[PDB]
Write a protein that binds this ligand. Structure first.
Ligand SMILES: OC[C@H]1O[C@H](O[C@H]2[C@H](O)[C@@H](O)[C@@H](O)O[C@@H]2CO)[C@H](O)[C@@H](O)[C@@H]1O
Ligand SMILES: [Ca+2]
Length: 135
C-alpha cells in the first residue's frame, strides 16, 4: 500500500496511533514519519490526506524547543514558514510538541499533543539493490 512520489514511498495508515507509537510502526517498516522539504511534496501529502489529520515527523528537539524532523533531515525554519496553519505553532496548553498535517491546503501543519491518536504517514527513500560500493 505504498504510494510513490519523487524518489520516496509513502504509507498512509488506516489505524490511529500516538506520535511515537506511529514512529515505531514506521521504523518497523524500515521508514520514518515523513519529513516535508518542498512545496510539491507538501501538496502531494495534503492532497493524498484528503482532509483527514495525519501525524508527520515534526517534533521538538534540543533545549530551545526547535522543531525538527525525526528522519534527521535538517529542519529549514525559513523554508517551512509557509507550511504552518496561520497562527501555528501555538503550543496550546504548553503541551504541543509533535506536528501533523491538518488543513487541506499548502498552509497545513498544526502542532498537537504527542499523546493524541491520529492516522500517520511513513516515508522511505527508494534504495536500489546493488552490490557493495566499497570495492
Ligand atoms: O484552532 C486551532 C487549535 O484547534 C485545536 O484545539 C481544539 C482541541 O483539540 C479540542 O479538544 C477542544 O478543546 O477545542 C479546541 C478548539 O479551540 C488544536 O488542539 C490546537 O492545537 C489548534 O492550534
Ligand atoms: Ca496547535
Amino acid at each position: 500500500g505504498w504510494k510513490y512520489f519523487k524518489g520516496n514511498f509513502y504509507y498512509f495508515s488506516l489505524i490511529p496511533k500516538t506520535w511515537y507509537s506511529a514512529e515505531q510502526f514506521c521504523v518497523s517498516r524500515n521508514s520514518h514519519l515523513t519529513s516535508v522539504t518542498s512545496e510539491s511534496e507538501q501538496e502531494f501529502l495534503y492532497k493524498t490526506a484528503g482532509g483527514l489529520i495525519y501525524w508527520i515527523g515534526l517534533t521538538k528537539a534540543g533545549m530551545e524547543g526547535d522543531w525538527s524532523w525525526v528522519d534527521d533531515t535538517p529542519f529549514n525554519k525559513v523554508q517551512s514558514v509557509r507550511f504552518w496553519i496561520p497562527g501555528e505553532p501555538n503550543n496550546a496548553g504548553n503541551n504541543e510538541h509533535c506536528g501533523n498535517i491538518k488543513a487541506p491546503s499548502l498552509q497545513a501543519w498544526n502542532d498537537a499533543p504527542c499523546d493524541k491518536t491520529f492516522l500517520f504517514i511513513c516515508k522511505r527513500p527508494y534504495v536500489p539493490s546493488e552490490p557493495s560500493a566499497w570495492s
